[PDB]
Amino acid sequence: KPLTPSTYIRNLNVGILRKLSDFIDPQEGWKKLAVAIKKPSGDDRYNQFHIRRFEALLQTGLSPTCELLFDWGTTNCTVGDLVDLLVQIELFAPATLLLPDAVPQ
């Protein structure tokens, strides 16, 4: 089904998750995203030790972006939330992957 801002991250299909990984895992994109995600209190959702755990996934050939999205997706955050964060951290390519109309041009 076509993505909308309301789609939950936990419902994204394998294909889109893998492609998001291709855009976000390189060049510490996943770490920019991980640091940017806030709890409702405004506090960081992920501390340095959470981030180190995601980092260690490279190198068993695993994707930190996937782990991050799987974990964060347990909060019922949405494609809209993710696109806001991607625009904020200037990872425009995966933003356009998900919601091309939501991206500043």
- What is the per-residue burial (b if ≥16 Cβ within 10 Å, else e) of 52-84? eebeebeeeeebbbbbbbebbbeeebbbbbbbb
Q: Are 78 and 8 in contact (CB under 8 A)?
A: yes
- Report all structural domains of the chain as residue ranges with CATH numbers, in order of start: 1-105 (1.10.533.10)
Nearest alpha-carbon partner for 23 in 53, 63, 51: 63
**How far apart are the two ends of the chain, measured CA to CA in Å?**
25
Alpha carbons 44 and 23: distance in angstroms, whole number? 23
Q: Taking the CA of residue 73 as centre, how many other CA atoms within 13 Å lie in the half-sphere pointing to its CB?
A: 16
Query: Resolution to 1 decimal, in Å?
Result: 1.7
Determination technique used: X-ray
Nearest alpha-carbon partner for 93 in 82, 78, 103, 81: 103
The interaxial angle of helices 29-36 and 64-72, nearest 10 deg, is 20
